[PDB]
Design a protein around this nucleic acid. Structure first.
Ligand code: MG
Ligand code: MG
Ligand code: MG
Ligand code: MG
Ligand code: MG
Ligand code: ZN
Lengths: 238, 92, 94
RNA sequence: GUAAUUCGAGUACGCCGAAAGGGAAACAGGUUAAUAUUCCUGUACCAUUUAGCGUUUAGUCUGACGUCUCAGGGCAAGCCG
RNA sequence: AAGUCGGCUUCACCCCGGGACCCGUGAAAAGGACAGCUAAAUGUCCGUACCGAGAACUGACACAGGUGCCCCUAGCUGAAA
RNA sequence: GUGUAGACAGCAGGUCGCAGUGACCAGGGGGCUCUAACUGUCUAAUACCAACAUAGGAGAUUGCAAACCCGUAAGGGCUAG
RNA sequence: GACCCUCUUAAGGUAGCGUAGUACCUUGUCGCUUAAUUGGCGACUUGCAUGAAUGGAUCAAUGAGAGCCCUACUGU
């Protein structure tokens, strides 16, 4: 048995591949609201979240419990939020996507109703509402695809803050090193062709070349799906 | 509304600043009080409590300043006596 | 006005702290981004230039006290500007 | 759950984990062959309980925080007449 | 046995405040403060000698290695340990 | 001469030796090529390199009850994403 | 040594570099460097068996990397 790969080591969950959970501030989710309820609340502070490298907002609600929230751009300390079914459309509120007009930008969209939000969450991303049929609504995801969501889904209006995070090049191994200390990723990563034939399917030889084609089928067993997994095309555009 | 302020600053009694305007309004000698649009809400409480007419100004205090003749910013200004001006006619 | 911009000391700007490293392209990009970041930005309530960067995407007004979330390197982004323009025109048409 | 356990991840309830993290309170001198803020002389200080004499504001503050760089004040050590 | 006075400097120690940097944001809980004052009584348990290293540890050794250079150190020359 | 000061900087004349940073301490320099951009890592005990890493460039999978992976299962890693 | 043809069992090397850390023949031929050089550098090159992210060419700063030359110095 030539040694397992890095992906299977991540599978086991050894301490080298586990996220340092105790650093993260808090989990981000929408307020839990019963049927036919509408709770409000005004921002108390704007705070930095080390799990995403973007700001988050602290909001104190009328019942008493405060929650961190995914901060859309423009959110300022003092503004009140009106999450609920009867909310109007403004930058900051949380409203169903069924009664959001076409052309408006949204973020922190849910998959099924009352999930808290799963799509459109990294820095500066956003999605759009395209069409409103009776049973579904099509939103263009930041990847570039059309998704058909339930009309009774919740999403904050605006775009996620922190836009432009990747216009600043690293230009050092040290800065990227410092980012990786608060993530589960491993840094730095050895290249496969420089290993031994025990360690990887590509290792070995008197000179460093893959030897076999890099594209691998989708049916390859675990421990072999390394390279271009089931690629449809390769190369740049000529 | 705009050219009257030129004569209000040229002639008559005027005071620039929030606190002196508060004093003039409470004393009542300030016939009218002029405020900028984006002023803090903490000032509107006195301008409603004071019986003095409340002349709005559509602009912001940042450009209100230079037109009044002062490079700095003017939040609330009162004209005690108009003299050779008719800004009061704009207000009352 | 500022530090000596001699016959030479004029191209690097803030990227002159890297010395002869990292190449021309990356240094130019970082320098230009830094002159955009160090700009005298303007407030939204005060309408006075007082906004500076507190953290990653956090901005504050020195005189006004107003705190808000914006871009990572610049306070206001073009997409947010477009959203404001469109929503405000829709509201004002009503 | 496992054929089954002394085996196995998670959840609930507990409980442990720092003689360099947090932390209520003591100093001088003497004494012995070998112990000393521990024994002796002097002068102090802090908690829990009991009894007497009164009272909350009870929700906040503190404990409680990175790297570099600099001004101001003070002081053990040091030096001069 | 004298046991009186002045002056300079002051880190590597204490207090206090400012600035810059981050695609790094730099612990938690017990405890304490805000209502206490007076009096007597109680304050159990464990460690405490000596070495801490070119002879008291570890490498079979009274071993030129390592753990510990972990934390501290006077006068002159000299930027200076 | 500067400075509140500690101190620091500068001058004029005389004079000794073979030699004045007089001992201690304390870079030899230049030119033409190959190679890796650089700072970093490495066969503990024969290999400190042109090898590994790196910022930069490009490609591929996946809209989350996802892609990739661990377990016989119960359940998990990535993921407070 | 062109270019019409080929052998074209898919196509038959574009820019570049070239006796190379790759050139067997080989101490390849010529120039600068020495009294004298299987060396170093430059030029040519019919490339046994160079060539474009199996990355090509060149490159300031850096190097306990690998060669050759000058000056000072010395019991090498
Ligand atoms: Mg194999
Ligand atoms: Mg304990
Ligand atoms: Mg190197
Ligand atoms: Mg390599
Ligand atoms: Mg020779
Ligand atoms: Zn402001």
């Amino acid at each position: 048995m030539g040694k397992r790969l890095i992906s299977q080591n991540r599978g086991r969950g050894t301490p080298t591949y586990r996220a340092p959970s105790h650093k993260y501030k808090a989990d981000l989710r929408h307020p839990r609201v019963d049927e036919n309820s509408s709770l409000r609340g005004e921002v108390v502070g704007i705070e930095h979240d080390p799990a995403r490298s973007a700001p988050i907002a602290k909001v104190a609600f009328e019942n008493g419990e405060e929650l961190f929230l995914l901060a859309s751009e423009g959110i300022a300390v003092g503004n009140i939020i009106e999450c609920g079914d009867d909310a109007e459309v403004k930058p900051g509120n949380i409203v169903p996507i069924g009664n959001v007009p076409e052309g408006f930008f949204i973020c922190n969209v849910e998959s099924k109703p009352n999930d808290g939000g799963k799509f459109v969450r990294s820095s500066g991303v956003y999605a759009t509402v395209v069409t409103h049929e009776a049973t579904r609504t099509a939103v263009s995801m930041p990847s570039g695809n059309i998704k058909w969501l339930n009309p009774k889904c919740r999403a904050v209006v605006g775009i996620v803050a922190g836009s432009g995070r990747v216009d600043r090049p690293w230009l050092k191994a040290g800065k990227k090193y410092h980012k990786m200390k608060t993530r589960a990723a491993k840094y730095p990563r050895v290249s496969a062709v420089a290993m031994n034939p025990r360690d990887h399917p590509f290792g070995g030889g008197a000179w460093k070349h893959p030897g076999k084609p890099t594209t691998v089928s989708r049916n390859a067993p675990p421990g072999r799906k390394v390279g271009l997994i089931a690629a449809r095309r390769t190369g740049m555009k000529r | 509304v705009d050219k009257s302020l030129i004569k209000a600053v040229k002639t008559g009694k005027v005071i620039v600043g929030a606190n002196r305007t508060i004093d003039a309004a409470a004393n009542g000698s300030a016939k009218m009080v002029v405020l900028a649009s984006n002023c803090p809400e903490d000032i509107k409480k006195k301008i409603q409590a004071t019986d003095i007419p409340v002349l709005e100004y559509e602009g912001t205090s940042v450009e209100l300043g230079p037109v009044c003749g002062k490079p700095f910013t003017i939040a609330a200004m009162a004209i005690l006596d108009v003299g050779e001006s008719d800004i009061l006619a704009a207000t009352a | 006005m500022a530090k000596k911009f001699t016959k030479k000391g004029r191209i690097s700007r803030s990227a002159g702290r890297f010395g002869p490293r990292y190449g021309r392209k990356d240094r130019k990009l970082v320098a230009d981004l830094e002159e955009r970041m160090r700009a005298p930005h303007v407030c939204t309530k005060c309408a006075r230039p007082t906004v500076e960067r507190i953290g990653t995407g956090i901005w504050k007004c020195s005189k006004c006290g107003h705190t808000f979330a914006g871009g990572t390197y610049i306070p206001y982004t073009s997409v947010g500007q477009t959203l404001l323009r469109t929503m405000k025109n829709i509201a004002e048409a009503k």
